[PDB]
Protein backbone atom coordinates (compact mmCIF):
# COMPACT_ATOMS: atom_id res chain seq x y z
CA UNK A 1 0.00 0.00 0.00
CA UNK A 2 3.10 2.14 0.38
CA UNK A 3 6.54 1.38 -1.03
CA UNK A 4 6.95 -2.14 -2.43
CA UNK A 5 10.26 -3.97 -2.86
CA UNK A 6 10.60 -6.92 -5.23
CA UNK A 7 13.91 -8.73 -4.74
CA UNK A 8 15.38 -11.19 -7.25
CA UNK A 9 17.27 -14.29 -6.08
CA UNK A 10 20.39 -12.64 -7.59
CA UNK A 11 20.19 -9.75 -5.08
CA UNK A 12 18.92 -7.00 -7.38
CA UNK A 13 15.51 -5.44 -6.72
CA UNK A 14 12.69 -3.19 -7.97
CA UNK A 15 11.36 -0.57 -5.55
CA UNK A 16 8.54 1.97 -5.71
CA UNK A 17 4.85 2.57 -5.13
CA UNK A 18 2.53 0.37 -7.20
CA UNK A 19 -0.69 1.28 -9.07
CA UNK A 20 -4.24 0.06 -8.31
CA UNK A 21 -3.49 -3.15 -10.22
CA UNK A 22 -0.40 -3.70 -8.06
CA UNK A 23 1.97 -2.90 -10.92
CA UNK A 24 5.40 -1.22 -10.69
CA UNK A 25 4.30 1.73 -12.85
CA UNK A 26 5.34 5.37 -12.45
CA UNK A 27 8.06 8.02 -12.72
CA UNK A 28 9.67 7.32 -9.36
CA UNK A 29 10.42 3.59 -9.71
CA UNK A 30 13.96 2.19 -9.35
CA UNK A 31 16.01 -0.87 -10.09
CA UNK A 32 18.69 -1.35 -7.42
CA UNK A 33 21.76 -3.46 -8.20
CA UNK A 34 22.99 -6.20 -5.81
CA UNK A 35 25.30 -3.74 -4.01
CA UNK A 36 22.08 -2.19 -2.64
CA UNK A 37 23.52 1.23 -3.56
CA UNK A 38 23.78 1.58 -7.34
CA UNK A 39 20.40 2.35 -8.91
CA UNK A 40 18.56 3.20 -12.13
CA UNK A 41 15.79 5.61 -11.13
CA UNK A 42 12.92 7.00 -13.15
CA UNK A 43 10.17 5.78 -15.43
CA UNK A 44 8.98 2.15 -15.28
CA UNK A 45 5.86 0.46 -16.67
CA UNK A 46 4.83 -2.76 -14.86
CA UNK A 47 8.38 -3.27 -13.64
CA UNK A 48 9.91 -2.64 -17.07
CA UNK A 49 12.50 0.15 -17.30
CA UNK A 50 11.46 2.88 -19.76
CA UNK A 51 13.86 5.56 -18.56
CA UNK A 52 16.25 4.77 -15.71
CA UNK A 53 18.74 7.47 -14.71
CA UNK A 54 21.89 6.50 -12.82
CA UNK A 55 21.37 7.13 -9.11
CA UNK A 56 22.60 6.19 -5.64
CA UNK A 57 20.41 4.76 -2.86
CA UNK A 58 21.48 7.12 -0.07
CA UNK A 59 19.24 5.80 2.68
CA UNK A 60 16.05 3.93 3.46
CA UNK A 61 13.58 4.90 6.16
CA UNK A 62 10.86 2.43 7.12
CA UNK A 63 11.17 0.89 3.66
CA UNK A 64 11.09 4.28 1.92
CA UNK A 65 14.20 4.75 -0.28
CA UNK A 66 15.97 8.05 -0.76
CA UNK A 67 17.58 8.34 -4.18
CA UNK A 68 20.08 10.96 -5.29
CA UNK A 69 20.77 11.17 -9.03
CA UNK A 70 24.36 10.77 -10.23
CA UNK A 71 25.89 13.60 -12.27
CA UNK A 72 25.57 13.37 -16.06
CA UNK A 73 23.09 12.12 -18.62
CA UNK A 74 23.53 8.36 -18.16
CA UNK A 75 20.08 6.94 -18.93
CA UNK A 76 19.13 3.29 -19.52
CA UNK A 77 16.07 1.42 -20.79
CA UNK A 78 14.89 -2.19 -21.01
CA UNK A 79 16.69 -3.17 -24.23
CA UNK A 80 16.53 -6.96 -24.43
CA UNK A 81 18.61 -8.51 -27.22
CA UNK A 82 17.19 -10.43 -30.21
CA UNK A 83 18.78 -13.15 -32.32
CA UNK A 84 20.63 -10.47 -34.36
CA UNK A 85 20.53 -7.28 -32.25
CA UNK A 86 22.85 -7.40 -29.23
CA UNK A 87 21.98 -3.88 -27.98
CA UNK A 88 20.53 -0.51 -29.04
CA UNK A 89 23.70 1.06 -27.64
CA UNK A 90 26.71 -1.28 -27.87
CA UNK A 91 29.16 1.30 -26.47
CA UNK A 92 27.12 2.32 -23.41
CA UNK A 93 28.74 0.45 -20.47
CA UNK A 94 26.89 -0.96 -17.48
CA UNK A 95 27.62 1.42 -14.56
CA UNK A 96 27.64 -1.30 -11.87
CA UNK A 97 30.02 -3.43 -13.93
CA UNK A 98 32.24 -0.41 -14.78
CA UNK A 99 33.06 0.07 -11.13
CA UNK A 100 33.99 -3.57 -10.63
CA UNK A 101 35.85 -5.03 -13.61
CA UNK A 102 38.11 -4.06 -16.49
CA UNK A 103 39.49 -5.83 -19.54
CA UNK A 104 43.26 -6.35 -19.96
CA UNK A 105 45.65 -8.92 -21.46
CA UNK A 106 45.05 -12.22 -19.65
CA UNK A 107 47.72 -13.68 -17.37
CA UNK A 108 47.03 -17.06 -18.99
CA UNK A 109 49.56 -17.44 -21.81
CA UNK A 110 48.16 -17.26 -25.36
CA UNK A 111 44.65 -16.70 -24.00
CA UNK A 112 44.07 -13.17 -25.30
CA UNK A 113 42.16 -10.67 -23.20
CA UNK A 114 40.90 -11.45 -19.71
CA UNK A 115 38.55 -9.92 -17.15
CA UNK A 116 40.04 -8.38 -14.00
CA UNK A 117 38.52 -7.07 -10.76
CA UNK A 118 38.93 -3.36 -9.86
CA UNK A 119 38.16 -4.06 -6.23
CA UNK A 120 38.70 -6.40 -3.30
CA UNK A 121 35.35 -8.08 -2.64
CA UNK A 122 33.93 -10.99 -0.66
CA UNK A 123 32.38 -14.34 -1.71
CA UNK A 124 29.21 -14.41 -3.84
CA UNK A 125 29.70 -10.94 -5.33
CA UNK A 126 28.17 -10.19 -8.73
CA UNK A 127 30.98 -8.64 -10.77
CA UNK A 128 30.04 -8.61 -14.45
CA UNK A 129 27.18 -9.34 -16.86
CA UNK A 130 27.06 -11.79 -19.73
CA UNK A 131 24.63 -10.29 -22.24
CA UNK A 132 24.53 -11.26 -25.90
CA UNK A 133 22.26 -12.17 -28.80
CA UNK A 134 19.71 -14.93 -28.18
CA UNK A 135 19.82 -17.98 -30.44
CA UNK A 136 18.56 -21.57 -30.14
CA UNK A 137 20.58 -24.60 -29.03
CA UNK A 138 19.96 -26.12 -32.45
CA UNK A 139 21.50 -23.12 -34.24
CA UNK A 140 24.54 -23.36 -31.94
CA UNK A 141 24.98 -27.15 -31.83
CA UNK A 142 24.48 -27.29 -35.62
CA UNK A 143 27.26 -24.97 -36.80
CA UNK A 144 31.06 -24.61 -37.05
CA UNK A 145 32.76 -24.98 -33.63
CA UNK A 146 34.78 -21.86 -34.47
CA UNK A 147 31.58 -19.78 -34.25
CA UNK A 148 31.10 -20.83 -30.62
CA UNK A 149 33.96 -19.20 -28.71
CA UNK A 150 31.44 -16.91 -26.99
CA UNK A 151 28.31 -19.09 -26.64
CA UNK A 152 26.80 -19.56 -23.17
CA UNK A 153 23.63 -21.57 -22.53
CA UNK A 154 21.00 -19.45 -20.77
CA UNK A 155 18.23 -21.98 -20.24
CA UNK A 156 16.41 -24.84 -21.97
CA UNK A 157 15.22 -22.56 -24.78
CA UNK A 158 18.06 -20.07 -25.23
CA UNK A 159 21.81 -19.69 -25.85
CA UNK A 160 23.56 -16.30 -25.37
CA UNK A 161 26.32 -15.34 -27.87
CA UNK A 162 28.71 -12.42 -28.46
CA UNK A 163 29.58 -12.95 -32.15
CA UNK A 164 32.07 -11.00 -34.28
CA UNK A 165 32.66 -8.07 -34.20
CA UNK A 166 31.06 -7.67 -30.76
CA UNK A 167 33.81 -9.80 -29.18
CA UNK A 168 35.95 -6.68 -29.48
CA UNK A 169 35.71 -4.08 -26.71
CA UNK A 170 35.98 -1.34 -29.34
CA UNK A 171 32.63 -2.51 -30.82
CA UNK A 172 30.83 -3.77 -27.74
CA UNK A 173 31.30 -2.89 -24.07
CA UNK A 174 27.70 -2.81 -22.77
CA UNK A 175 28.59 -5.99 -20.80
CA UNK A 176 31.95 -7.74 -20.33
CA UNK A 177 31.23 -11.23 -18.96
CA UNK A 178 32.37 -12.83 -22.22
CA UNK A 179 35.93 -11.68 -21.46
CA UNK A 180 36.36 -14.01 -18.47
CA UNK A 181 38.80 -16.80 -19.36
CA UNK A 182 38.67 -20.45 -18.24
CA UNK A 183 40.32 -22.14 -15.22
CA UNK A 184 40.04 -25.46 -13.37
CA UNK A 185 40.62 -23.49 -10.18
CA UNK A 186 38.19 -20.66 -10.96
CA UNK A 187 37.41 -17.83 -8.57
CA UNK A 188 33.97 -17.19 -10.18
CA UNK A 189 30.94 -19.02 -11.61
CA UNK A 190 28.32 -18.06 -14.17
CA UNK A 191 25.01 -17.42 -12.39
CA UNK A 192 21.42 -16.46 -13.39
CA UNK A 193 20.67 -12.72 -13.38
CA UNK A 194 17.56 -10.60 -14.09
CA UNK A 195 18.89 -7.31 -15.54
CA UNK A 196 16.70 -4.20 -15.94
CA UNK A 197 18.44 -3.35 -19.24
CA UNK A 198 19.39 -6.75 -20.66
CA UNK A 199 16.56 -8.85 -19.23
CA UNK A 200 17.18 -12.46 -18.17
CA UNK A 201 20.89 -13.21 -18.67
CA UNK A 202 23.85 -14.70 -16.82
CA UNK A 203 26.38 -12.90 -14.63
CA UNK A 204 29.86 -13.58 -13.26
CA UNK A 205 29.70 -14.16 -9.50
CA UNK A 206 32.76 -14.68 -7.24
CA UNK A 207 33.06 -18.00 -5.41
CA UNK A 208 35.19 -16.40 -2.76
CA UNK A 209 37.21 -13.34 -1.75
CA UNK A 210 39.02 -11.74 -4.70
CA UNK A 211 41.60 -8.95 -4.58
CA UNK A 212 41.82 -5.75 -6.60
CA UNK A 213 43.43 -6.51 -10.01
CA UNK A 214 42.94 -10.26 -9.61
CA UNK A 215 41.99 -12.01 -12.87
CA UNK A 216 38.41 -13.34 -12.82
CA UNK A 217 38.00 -16.88 -14.13
CA UNK A 218 35.18 -19.40 -14.51
CA UNK A 219 35.20 -23.14 -15.28
CA UNK A 220 33.81 -23.41 -18.83
CA UNK A 221 32.67 -26.98 -18.17
CA UNK A 222 32.93 -28.65 -21.56
CA UNK A 223 38.44 -27.19 -28.29
CA UNK A 224 42.25 -27.55 -28.42
CA UNK A 225 43.60 -25.03 -25.86
CA UNK A 226 41.23 -26.55 -23.30
CA UNK A 227 42.22 -30.21 -23.64
CA UNK A 228 45.87 -29.15 -23.36
CA UNK A 229 45.26 -27.13 -20.19
CA UNK A 230 43.34 -30.14 -18.88
CA UNK A 231 46.49 -32.29 -19.26
CA UNK A 232 48.52 -29.51 -17.61
CA UNK A 233 46.18 -29.44 -14.61
CA UNK A 234 45.79 -33.17 -13.88
CA UNK A 235 49.55 -33.25 -13.35
C1 LIG B 1 30.13 -22.26 -20.66
C2 LIG B 1 31.31 -22.26 -21.60
C3 LIG B 1 31.98 -20.89 -21.68
C4 LIG B 1 31.18 -19.96 -22.58
C5 LIG B 1 31.71 -18.53 -22.54
C6 LIG B 1 33.08 -18.44 -23.20
N1 LIG B 1 33.48 -17.05 -23.53
C7 LIG B 1 34.90 -17.17 -23.88
C8 LIG B 1 35.52 -15.92 -24.47
N2 LIG B 1 36.98 -16.04 -24.49
C9 LIG B 1 37.47 -15.33 -23.31
C10 LIG B 1 37.87 -13.93 -23.76
C11 LIG B 1 39.06 -13.97 -24.72
N3 LIG B 1 40.29 -14.13 -23.97
C12 LIG B 1 39.10 -12.69 -25.51
O1 LIG B 1 40.17 -12.04 -25.57
O2 LIG B 1 38.05 -12.32 -26.10
C13 LIG B 1 37.38 -17.46 -24.49
C14 LIG B 1 38.52 -17.59 -25.48
O3 LIG B 1 39.70 -17.08 -24.84
C15 LIG B 1 40.75 -18.04 -24.90
N4 LIG B 1 40.85 -18.74 -23.61
C16 LIG B 1 39.93 -18.78 -22.63
N5 LIG B 1 40.37 -19.50 -21.57
C17 LIG B 1 41.60 -19.93 -21.86
C18 LIG B 1 42.64 -20.75 -21.18
N6 LIG B 1 42.42 -21.26 -19.95
N7 LIG B 1 43.79 -20.96 -21.85
C19 LIG B 1 44.02 -20.46 -23.08
N8 LIG B 1 43.12 -19.72 -23.76
C20 LIG B 1 41.92 -19.42 -23.20
C21 LIG B 1 40.35 -19.00 -25.99
O4 LIG B 1 40.76 -18.44 -27.25
C22 LIG B 1 38.85 -19.02 -25.90
O5 LIG B 1 38.27 -19.35 -27.16
From Swiss-Prot:
Keywords: Activator, Chromatin regulator, Chromosome, Methyltransferase, Nucleus, Repeat, S-adenosyl-L-methionine, Transcription, Transcription regulation, Transferase
Tissue: Widely expressed. Expressed in pancreatic islets.
UniProt effect for mutating residue 202 to A: Induces a reduction in methyltransferase activity toward TAF10 but an increased methyltransferase activity for H3 and p53/TP53
Main subcellular location: nucleus
GO cellular component, one term: nucleus
Enzyme Commission number(s) of this protein: 2.1.1.364
Catalytic activity: L-lysyl(4)-[histone H3] + S-adenosyl-L-methionine = N(6)-methyl-L-lysyl(4)-[histone H3] + S-adenosyl-L-homocysteine + H(+); L-lysyl-[protein] + S-adenosyl-L-methionine = N(6)-methyl-L-lysyl-[protein] + S-adenosyl-L-homocysteine + H(+)
Family: Belongs to the class V-like SAM-binding methyltransferase superfamily. Histone-lysine methyltransferase family. SET7 subfamily.
Domains (record comment): The SET domain is necessary but not sufficient for histone methyltransferase activity.
Protein function: Histone methyltransferase that specifically monomethylates 'Lys-4' of histone H3. H3 'Lys-4' methylation represents a specific tag for epigenetic transcriptional activation. Plays a central role in the transcriptional activation of genes such as collagenase or insulin. Recruited by IPF1/PDX-1 to the insulin promoter, leading to activate transcription. Also has methyltransferase activity toward non-histone proteins such as CGAS, p53/TP53, TAF10, and possibly TAF7 by recognizing and binding the [KR]-[STA]-K in substrate proteins.
UniProt protein name: Histone-lysine N-methyltransferase SETD7
Residues of the full protein shown: 116 to 362 of 366
